[PDB]
Symmetry: D2
Subunit: 356 residues, 4 copies
């Protein structure tokens, strides 16, 4: 269990960007800029800085050329400069390794703190950032599948209750989760900005980054991305969806970039800003909890996730999840799921829904 | 092979309605009227007459209470009264059993001819029909998943080339089909009204009715139907989709009514009215031919289909398809499919795409 | 009045393209290609050939450099080559001027007939046309405001009943019209292809081309066009809309190109292929007849229209309309229009709706 | 000028509900429930409590039967119960009239404070509220024009800079405003919850409530509202729109209820939660500032607004605006507005855009 520090927690505003190491910068560029239409804030032979349509801070994604594809940093912007200090004292009290550069680790970012948090994830906290032209009304640049905002991250970690508690102490509030009757927690969504989540914990071997998610204005914007991937003959890069999530109620799509980093295009979840926002708990066996329409969750979604780096550039060692696997308890040979609780009709046993 | 009659073929306008036998009228009513929102033109204890939002003829669907769920008639409206006679002479020349009632077989229809066509399907041809209020502008009745028109039928039959030829002689023109390099034809789409199809042939054991299809105005109308089925906890009744078809380029969804009759909600295919409309032929192994995004085609889609009746009310005997099964050659243990022709990467062998 | 020829009418399929004379090729290209995203089938220093997203014939619009902006030809495609011959004989029996070129009048068209019809409009009939790549599934090229097909033309002529009889004899069927309780007809819509219209007659001084119309897949594609024009600071070139039409029930938008040729973006009207399709007749004073939401019709919409050229390139003399003018009768000094028949609330006397 | 209290301001979360006095409960119910589809949380012969689709607090709108249609209270929810106490002390230090009821002023609300603020508006602060069923996934109840959340209020006050300072001291942050090259401010938008605004100040005679605003998921949901109103022959109750706002970039529509209270349907504005969110300032003469497409702003939109009641139920005296009026300065006899700064084309002198 992770202790609650005496030091006051920093006031986190929202997830702001992620820095991903990629192996071939040109292929990645083609995927992110040519296929997805993200806007370049800056680029050189080692990195590409990307921002979504409505963003004003410098970037929501940093592609960094490297030998091994992995997550290098997931960054949260804090409310004031002083919160960067509060973050430094907070993680030191927790005994975590931290590093601080008064002029940032990446272009366009100012004073920043990076840490190997208790779950082994490289987190960044910063306030100062370079403002860039906010393209929210540049309709002459609007593509049919325009990505408008960065919305959340999703982390794969072994013990969800352990991570939940630590993030709750950090100020994130849980909006939805998934449990079973034997007391096992499989996943939790937590927020800071007022949407369903800024980050989430998915139970599994970790530390690993499950995905980064961007949102679109409307559902047809997500449909366009699939259509365009079909036209480009890269539909094998569409991993799952599109669909309507049960948890978070958002319309979604998961695709894979050149190095297998998973990207989620998401839209239309609901407001959670009120402090007494009602928490929704879903049963792991409810076949409408992940996909509201009952579609099977592809197995690679549960098994495949990106590696993460420590502050030295090395890949973090992966810890095995000891609790029940969501995949095993639902689509494994000894798992089951239902459409209607207690109704054998429309339920599945040791088999995925829809005949697979 | 089916001979081309000397008698002139009737001028068929479009598919107009289908009469389906159902086992429990109240359950079926709940599905078609309460869930799907079709509009009642008339109903009594034995039948329910339904029409879509923009229809002016009496009905696009007739639910008839019966002991065995099956297709009783798929009806095409012809251009003039005289075409009903031309249809009578045409099928008699073909040696088919025909029946004709100067006042229709169902309410709201006038002089009509029903036949057991060369493929064993009960076809109806009629001109006269009762006009009803056209609801195209009754926005006060518009539901979020409004079905606006009846678009096509899809027939399951053993020998596609055999049926194609007969329908071509009847005046339908082929817009798209699916073949392989060994000369096997798996399916064909043919039209009369200017859209991709009024009917289609799907290779398999038959005669069987694969599905009836309705269209919506926009793609979000189709999304709403899935969402509503999730809210009602009947997502197990969603068989496949939604998706973008490769063939026909339409956005689609397949759902199952209480008796397993398959309904397709479809939208936005293209114009085919020009006589030299370019025909598109797809390779059976192209994984983007059915679902443009690469999603696996659920096996029940290929195996399950509705029974059809002869003119006496008996179920037609089913003939086995002798040619290669589309399911076997693509997702069977000895089948394969590709994303990019000639690229092993993104191809599937004895396994369905997406991990199933 | 215009006589019904003895010669059989040609079999018309649909409106196929319009040839417009523009004064500055570069500016027009900017509008039609960069702003609207139409696709270039061919271009040189004198002309630009554009086609919509789902078209397979050579083009839907020909921009020709000339000294006076005007309409040079509105082309309809006929069913067979012989129909061109039938069209020639038909117009000759009408005593109209004809001109035939077996090699066509513009690139991409073959044997074709151009005539100066009875209403003074330059109509072209043709069958042969060079097939080009149908871009209907090129989602990698799909813009957020993609124009997918050419839908109709709209002509301004002095006497509507007169032109109507002529076009009905030619095979066009009226779907909707606007009249007053005194028999004066203000406008008629007629089709060949099964949508509300291929062309329409708007009462006013003519001959003049009121507008050419393209359609999109969904309503949001039309919103994008408006949004993009705002971003490019050319919102003054948006004349009227977006709105919902009363007549035709389609979502619409009217914009002006560099020489003031009016272009309508249009979507989702209904099926009219059945020969007994019910005709709708709106009263001219009904304020929901043109814009279903009661938005006022801009004055220029009734007064400004494009000039038409005779076969020698001269501008056709304009004949004054003698019957009541729709503008005067509804939004003029002594105009009147209502929301509900007989209700004083929601009615407008001598002014437009909404306070203008 | 209004003094900045010494007492700490209460922590405001978002606008939560408006209590409107209506003269005929039955007619208003028809409008808000049957026409708009808002959900009834509770009702009796004197009041109707309505909530939007995704709300979990008791209600977003209270319709109260009374003799003079007016605004009785605009309520903001605060972070904690103690914030109510903080609000009371804050307003008392301002010398404003306060009234507190530990049992609340309307059903479903607990301890609450109502005050007659410095601008003469009846504001309510509260934390406790009865939780009800969050209908966010009840797709079986989702209408084609579903209102999903309450978004903002809009107040008409004489002096904008004055009210702005007061609200900034209260914790609101300005996101956008409209000014002229002469320092006169015409309107300001300010938020607490991270969207463009929770409330706004429109210059004009006040206090008056300009409108309450709800949002939808997508643009087509707003189109449906317009279409439905046309079907119900009440299009005269559509005041302005639909359009795209310049300020806020949201898709919008303004309708009038039975007593003429203005309701705005609104969607897709952007994120403003970061404390250094860039402020946008539009020039009053810029014709794309209110309607991005340059459509004219209806006169009544600037002159008509709802009355507000003091805490005793009397109508608040209305103070005349002394600064230039936005209407006069842009569409009046000596008004002026432009599409492009300095360009004579697309500019309007002494008249509205589009010819009115
Ligand atoms: Fe996610
Ligand atoms: Fe189909
Ligand atoms: Fe038109
Ligand atoms: Fe507003």
């Amino acid at each position: 269990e992770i202790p609650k520090p005496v030091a006051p927690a920093p006031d986190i505003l929202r997830c702001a960007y992620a820095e991903l190491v990629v192996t071939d910068l040109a292929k990645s560029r083609n995927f992110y800029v040519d296929v997805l239409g993200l806007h370049v804030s800056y680029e050189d032979e080692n990195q590409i800085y990307l921002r979504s349509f409505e963003e004003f801070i410098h970037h929501n994604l940093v592609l960094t050329k490297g030998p091994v594809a992995a997550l290098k940093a997931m960054a949260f912007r804090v409310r004031t400069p002083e919160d960067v200090d509060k973050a430094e004292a907070y993680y030191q009290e927790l005994g975590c390794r931290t590093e601080r550069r008064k002029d940032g680790f990446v272009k366009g970012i100012g004073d920043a703190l990076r840490v190997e948090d208790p779950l082994g994830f490289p987190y960044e906290f910063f306030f100062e950032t370079t403002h860039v032209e906010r393209l929210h009304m540049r309709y002459d640049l609007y593509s049919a599948g325009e990505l408008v905002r960065l919305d959340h991250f999703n982390q794969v970690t072994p013990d969800v209750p352990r991570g939940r508690k630590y993030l709750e102490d950090l100020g994130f509030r849980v909006t939805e989760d998934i449990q079973d009757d034997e007391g096992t927690t499989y996943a939790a969504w937590m927020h800071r900005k007022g949407t369903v989540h800024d980050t989430a914990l998915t139970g599994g071997n970790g530390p690993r980054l499950h995905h980064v998610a961007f949102s679109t204005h409307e559902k047809h914007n997500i449909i366009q991305i699939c259509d365009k991937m079909g036209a480009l003959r890269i539909s094998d890069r569409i991993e799952r969806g599109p669909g309507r999530h049960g948890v978070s109620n958002a319309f979604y799509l998961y695709i894979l970039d050149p190095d297998n980093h998973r990207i989620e295009i998401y839209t239309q979840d609901y407001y959670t800003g009120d402090p007494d926002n009602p928490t929704i708990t879903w049963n792991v066996h409810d076949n409408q909890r992940r996909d509201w329409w009952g579609n099977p969750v592809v197995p690679s979604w549960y098994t495949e996730a990106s590696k993460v780096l420590d502050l030295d550039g090395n890949v973090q060692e992966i810890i095995e999840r000891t609790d029940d696997s969501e995949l095993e308890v639902t689509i494994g040979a000894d798992g089951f799921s239902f459409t209607r609780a207690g109704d054998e009709d429309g339920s599945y046993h040791g088999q995925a829904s829809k005949g697979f």
